[PDB]
Amino acid sequence: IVRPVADFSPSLWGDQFLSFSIKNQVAEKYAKEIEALKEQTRNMLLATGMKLADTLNLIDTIERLGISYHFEKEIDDILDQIYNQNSNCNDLCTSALQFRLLRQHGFNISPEIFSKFQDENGKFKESLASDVLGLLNLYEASHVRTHADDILEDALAFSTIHLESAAPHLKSPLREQVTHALEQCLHKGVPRVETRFFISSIYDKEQSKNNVLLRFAKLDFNLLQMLHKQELAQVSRWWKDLDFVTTLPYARDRVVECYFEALGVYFEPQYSQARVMLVKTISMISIVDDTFDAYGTVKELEAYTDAIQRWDINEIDRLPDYMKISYKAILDLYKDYEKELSSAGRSHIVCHAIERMKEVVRNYNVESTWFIEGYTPPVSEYLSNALATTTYYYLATTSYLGMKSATEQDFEWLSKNPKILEASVIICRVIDDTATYEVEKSRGQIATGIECCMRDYGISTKEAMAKFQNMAETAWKDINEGLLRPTPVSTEFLTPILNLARIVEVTYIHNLDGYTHPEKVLKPHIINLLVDSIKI
């Protein structure tokens, strides 16, 4: 039986991540100074008599510098008190910032704060077009809308057109901040990526900058980077010992891109165990996906699928030799997870991630069947299968495995496919289909999302892409609404789902697959997050 020959690119990275040896003198020096810098910062936040605008700017800056995770409780109290005071600044800049920060933290502040900035038709007063700081903060706020927020329906276009017009004549680094915002809004970016751009390209170059906060942010970023490098090295060794790069040469070699995805889901050190477990799943499921998409035949794929459903080390013998490799690796990985979680008494939650994996495999196989039969389903039927093949239900469930505070009840809410999770899954699916359409159509994938959408509604490739765009925008409103209090689970368990959607926006920016073409999209981010430290 002849196979299709491998056309995926080898790893850009070689061995450069395989061993990282932390300099503990540096590490312990950084940590000792950070503690002093941390407390000076706490006292800035707890300073009394601050005006509203200065308080929001302080919180905003600490968040953009990537250090707010040290002050979750302090920032919460301050925003809560601001929420309940329901103050009214007449400043567009302060109003838009107040709106965004509160909404991003779950406080359902009313969009009527923007009415004083609009005319009769609820269109923004064009006299505000010369207030660049107002437009910037309005622009960032325009991305955290829910469905109750149509008063803001004009904010994105209004702020965009005038930021575009003003940008070339702005001073630095404001000009670079505005230009970056137009390319990547804050709310939908990956946090470490935006933090690193803000520290090095913006705050470092601000004459007004606060030296305590800047030094804090540089040391903390570089200190956390040392941890991430340890994790990546330990994950690179685990991947090396598996050796699929030689035994399964059809498969993509992308463990570093997978680690970046895990790092976008959470970066804080308390999630180190959760991150390592997560990368291993993303890597492993990536292999299954290449098996289905570029190597196995119908009968091997059926035996693989059924073996996955039965999930028993008695079943290896039914698979061809190449499938025995991954199948045992999959089963081992999950026994590893169960052992990893035993000392905390949390081994019993691994079954939830396993059930989601079985679901992904079932739907991979359906997708193969559709490709072989030349079947083009209607959109609703396409989605019923293709949403799970994003892997995003699986990854979200996986993301909880290493989170020591995640309980059985948390997994039960997630098993019911809650609305915030569905929207994140929908964002991944429709953005991916828009970006991968023309290429996987060239490979004859008759059942690709845009195709189903054209055939179903009888519309052009362009009208189908616009329909998929609106599905993404609807999903972002649902994500944003799913973060508002009272939340159905702790916000700690919502942020990974939000971050999975951010990963989508960052990976397919301006519409190229970035995990399969990592050198265009993901390579600069991996260098900036995992190779180069921030120059102090």
Binding site for Mg ion (CB under 5 A): 289, 292-293, 432, 436
* Spatial CA neighbour of 141 closest among 160, 120, 128, 165: 160
Q: How far is the CB of 289 from Mg ion (least distance, A)?
A: 5
CB of 288 to Mg ion, least distance (A): 8
Eight-class DSSP state of 199: I
- Tell the smallest beta-carbon distance from residue 380 to Mg ion (Å): 19
* Tokens 């010992």 -> residue: 241
Query: What phi, psi does 364 have (nearest 5°)?
Result: -55, -50
What residues form the annotated binding site?
Answer: 252, 289, 293, 429, 432-433, 436, 440
Contacts 24+ apart (CB under 8 A), 145-148: 145/476, 145/477, 145/480, 146/477, 146/480, 146/481, 146/484, 147/477, 147/478, 147/481, 148/111, 148/481
* CB-nearer residue toward Mg ion: 68 or 436: 436
Distance of closest approach, residue 444 Cβ to Mg ion, in angstroms: 14
Nearest residue relative to Mg ion (C-beta):
293
Is residue 494 within 8 Å of 487, Cβ to Cβ?
Answer: yes
Which residue number, 102 or 360, has a Cβ lying nearer to Mg ion? 360
Please state the residue numbers annotated as binding site for (2E,6E)-farnesyl diphosphate.
252, 289, 293, 429, 432
Ramachandran bin of 445, using left for φ above 0, alpha for ψ from -120 to 50, beta for the remaining angles: beta
Give whichever of 222 and 507 is closer to Mg ion, judged by the CB atom: 507
Q: Which long-range contacts (CB under 8 A, 24 or more apart) does 278-281 make?
A: 278/395, 278/398, 278/399, 278/401, 278/402, 279/231, 279/235, 279/255, 280/235, 280/238, 280/333, 281/333, 281/353, 281/357, 281/394, 281/395, 281/398
CB of 512: closest distance to Mg ion in angstroms? 12
Measured from the CB atom, the residue of 80 and 513 that comes closer to Mg ion is 513
Residue number, 204 or 289, with CB nearest to Mg ion: 289
CB of 112 to Mg ion, least distance (A): 41
On whether the CB atoms of residues 219 and 33 are closer than 8 A, the answer is yes
CB of 149 or CB of 300, closer to Mg ion: 300
* Residue number with CB closer to Mg ion (203 or 250): 250
Residues at the binding site for Mg(2+) are: 289, 293, 432-433, 436, 440
Using DSSP, state whether 249 is helix, strand or coil: coil
Distance separating alpha carbons of residues 23 and 533, to the nearest angstrom = 14
The first and second tokens of residue 531, run together, are 């190779």
Could you give the C-alpha distances from 391 to 33, 281, 421, in angstroms and in order?
41, 10, 12
What is the nearest approach in angstroms of Mg ion to the Cβ of residue 440?
6
Between CA 512 and CA 262 the distance in angstroms is 20
Nearest to 401 by CA among 358, 342, 360: 342
Q: 432 or 481, CB closer to Mg ion?
A: 432
- Give me the least distance between CB of 432 and Mg ion, in Å please: 5
